[model samples]
Target: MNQPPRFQNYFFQSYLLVYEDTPVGTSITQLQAVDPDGEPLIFGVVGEEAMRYFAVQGTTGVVWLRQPLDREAKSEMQVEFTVSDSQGVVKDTVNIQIGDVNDNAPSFYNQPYAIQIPENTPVGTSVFMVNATDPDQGVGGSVLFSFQPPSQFFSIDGARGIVTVTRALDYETTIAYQLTVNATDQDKRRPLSSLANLAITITDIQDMDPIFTNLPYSTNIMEDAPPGYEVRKIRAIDQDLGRPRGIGYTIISGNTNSMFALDYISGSLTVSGQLDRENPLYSSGFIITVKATELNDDRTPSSATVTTTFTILLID
Candidate 1:
């Protein structure tokens, strides 16, 4: 029996599997194609400025082509094929639809994000936000974002595209913070596969004032107690919630760690070179100056400083 429409009048579809729809590689002579009529059509695959994929059946049917299709085994592309028996002569094209399948998983821009937020942002707070991307056109919300522990501190609104606070933020305890986030996407159809744990991070901030334990002190260094003697050590404080901003201490002015050195990093003070308490110059009270700068959120002492006097007691 002669089929009404010959397979020659029907068409087949061809596509290349690619990533991000961007195809690259050497010229691939062989191509893949299938017809809606469950017929296999030979493909004349030619890769050049762009891959020109057409059916080798030499049929006068409408050929479907996908632009820059993927060329990878894991990737996928879809096109319909319509065909009939060779004896069948029909003026109409038998329409067929080829649907896309979930052959690949969703991916994210990055992973293991190192993020920070102000200690003031509160606990259970959404310190950072991340968005997942997927190329699958069939599935809705193929990519999803979620918190590891929904109640440990924060919550994420997947569909709304937001990260929100679920706890209180305190500056005195934690001035800064770090966090990890997860990103995942689904396949368009069944047997879905997805990639988890893309990176999302936040950086901490400093925000406290320094407290002085002792200020403007006066003392005398016995002449017998010569150089390398502890004239005096000054103590300055810093308040940060998350230990951000350089071990949390700094000296903004006139005192340093050398010749008149101070542990600017930890508010520790020490003499630099040498000191002769018996020397006329060292026998009198010498003024020592020091300053403390706040971390996270203090512009610093417009001039926060402490002045102490050291005198070498003269011995008969």
Candidate 2:
């Protein structure tokens, strides 16, 4: 406070830690600073701007370091530090740096995999496979693959991109998969076999017959029904866990549509024809049935039926 001193003796004038990209977890660097007064100062202390402040780091810092991305982040973070002098001059305000480390999980090229092949590939036939790359080198940082959810229907070669008929791949039974892979080196990872999730998707080149979620489904429809009424719907679900909309969706059969029409896209069974009280016995909760087959074309269709009984009672 006397001469507003520029102080004597420069302790740690200005030091730097170079980073390539966004450094991973706690991108921290050990730092120590001494003043002309010969005292060492730590990071976050009361009077020193509350010390230990975070500097701004970004995705393009230097090199993309490894971070623990086991789950979704509650919040993103940038790291930093602070320093002060004996004479109480806080200069180089936010000039702390953190070295980058490759300690993060590998990201998939795409969120999901949709690999495709013919429904019936011969045993040991290389149907289709997936591939990936790792930024980090050596053991733990290397990328590899593995089959997920024990496919009794098909087999996958982990190291090589080979798919074969483990049993028999019928679109009627199994459609697609959410296969996962790990990109790491044994030296860089723990447990020798960890997964990064590459998302090996298997698209069906040819379709098989569709199977229904429930078969012989019976329900009641409204009597004296007006057109565009939702009497019943066809529900067909494929066994594949991660298949697409076009693979095993529902389709309707039995075209008595002059009186009843089914919306192809919506699976809604509506009245396509008009009716009066004296028209038919079905005017009061009549029974109309329809069948549903699989979602796509080019193979056997899995099928199911829904019966709708519509009854109309007097409002006297």
Candidate 3:
């Protein structure tokens, strides 16, 4: 009488572990099946996915990899093995666990990130959060964030990926920053990394007042100086970033009968009336107040005023 092939009690179900990096055609495990009649046995694997990735020997019960495996795609799989002899066939299922490797690098969800904040934003303030992900498992999947070409103005949290201001921001000093952010896995042996760009823009704030270059401006004009004669050109600057709105000049006080004209755009001061040195009212000279106003886009513009003395003592 012929007998069917049979797997011993313990050999009915087998558990095997293999690394994803295992080379193709490498044997992972062998199944043992015996026939009572001592007939030769042929082994085969069932299932499309199992057949695509693995193969079983016909004469021997050895199972080998037919293609490379990726733990990220499929962490674990089940393969059914059939051992056949002249009498009958016996089937057993095996569980295969794929091990992880440091093959995948951390990746940022957004390729490039951008944010805007006021120049006066306080230091140590959280600006933005940069996030990254890893497909690997365990330590190889843990991601750490860092910045390249370190900046004194900004810092990042390695664990949380939060970016903060390290130093006070000034629009006049720097309007924008382009930073390179790196996301590296915690793989101790061979860590993998990826790079992303972060763009930060500092907005302008009307925090500065116009400053005059020279203080206590004094000039002398000859008696009988013609109207429209150039007297003095006052200069002032607004230390703000970006395109300047404007700087306007005006006689805030002490015009002395409107004898001088201040150009609003050019800041040019010129004689607008007759200059009579012999007149007692003009003998004492004239003190006029000039104001430089920042024509910003805000409701209240910042301005600075200075008093200039003009003497008509020079004889023509």
Candidate 4:
């Protein structure tokens, strides 16, 4: 008489633990069964989840993986196994626990971060914060922040992800910067990391003074040169972005007898009085000091000075 198959080494409920990163086609466990009438038996897996993730050998009762596993997707699963003979079928259940692995890398909330600050921002000032997350468990889930192409102007807290200014910033030197930021997991064996872009723009602050392009200027003019004669044009530039509100020029010193005139807006130097080579004061060359005053929107003024020497020549 044919008899139903019986499990030789089966538990009502068995537990097995496996890492989620375990490769497919790797044997997980073996099921043993026998038939009383000495009939050959076949082994198979039951349930949708079992069929989707695992498979069993027909005659050997060896169970192996059908696909990859992800603990983040489903941590625990139940699988049922069956042994069949001509008489009937017998079944058992196994509870499979999926363990965590350092498979996922850290991810930043923002792909590219941007911020703007004045060039005069103080050192050690906190500018902005960066945030990242990891779905893994334990050390793999802990994230640390860092910046690439190491910068002397900025620094970041590894644990807190707070960005701060480390050195002085100048809008005239560098207006903008692009830094590559990284988020890395604390996995000791194999750390995973991700990259993000950080954009920083420096705003202009009216902190710089006007700079004279030409200095210690010298010129020669005839004593008979009429008044209103153009002598020289003073040139200067403000280093601050977009320049100051306005720049005005004036004759500061050495204009004996009101002999020289300066155009405040155009920086033009001209002769305003009679020139006489016979006069002691007019014969000897004299220095004329010109001052360029930069007025900001707030009416704050910054000035720079330059001197020009004038020599009057006698007519032949």
Q: How large is the C-alpha RMSD of every model relative to the true structure?
A: 13.3, 19.0, 3.8, 4.2
Task: Give a tens-digit lDDT track for model 3, residues 26-74.
Answer: 9987778767786788888888988898888897778799998899888
Estimate the lDDT of model 2.
0.44
Supply candidate 1's per-residue lDDT for 256. Answer: 21
Per-residue accuracy of model 2 over 1-316 as CA lDDT, tens digit each: 3221131222234534434344354444334444445454434322232122332232112222244321122122233334444444343333324333354544445445555655556666665555555444345355556555556655666556455557655555555655555443344434244453433343454343345554455554444567777656656544443453332222233333256666655566566676544445433434444444444445554342223333323221
Return the lDDT, model 3, position 144.
89
TM-score of each: 0.39, 0.30, 0.80, 0.79
Clash count of each predicted structure: 38, 43, 0, 0
Model 3 misplaced regions, further than 4 Å = 1-14, 34-42, 58-60, 213-218, 233-237, 241-268, 272-289, 295-316
Mind sharing the TM-score for model 4? Answer: 0.79
Better of 1 and 3 by TM-score: 3
Model 3 earns a TM-score of: 0.80
**lDDT tens digits, residues 1-316, model 1?**
3323323322332233323333333232232233345443332222242224333233433333444444233233333333334333222222222234444555555555445455456555555556566555556336666665343445667654356767765555444344444545444335333433423333344445556566554554443554355555556554443453332334344332243455655555545555554455545535554455543345333332333333323343
Best by lDDT: 4
Clashing residue pairs for model 4: none
Identify the superior model by lDDT, candidate 3 or candidate 4: 4
Q: Taking the tens digit of each residue's C-alpha lDDT, what string does model 4 give over 70-107?
A: 99999988877899988677887778889899999998
Which residue runs does candidate 4 get wrong by more than 4 Å? 1-15, 30-45, 56-62, 80-95, 280-283, 298-316
| lDDT of all predictions | 0.43, 0.44, 0.81, 0.81
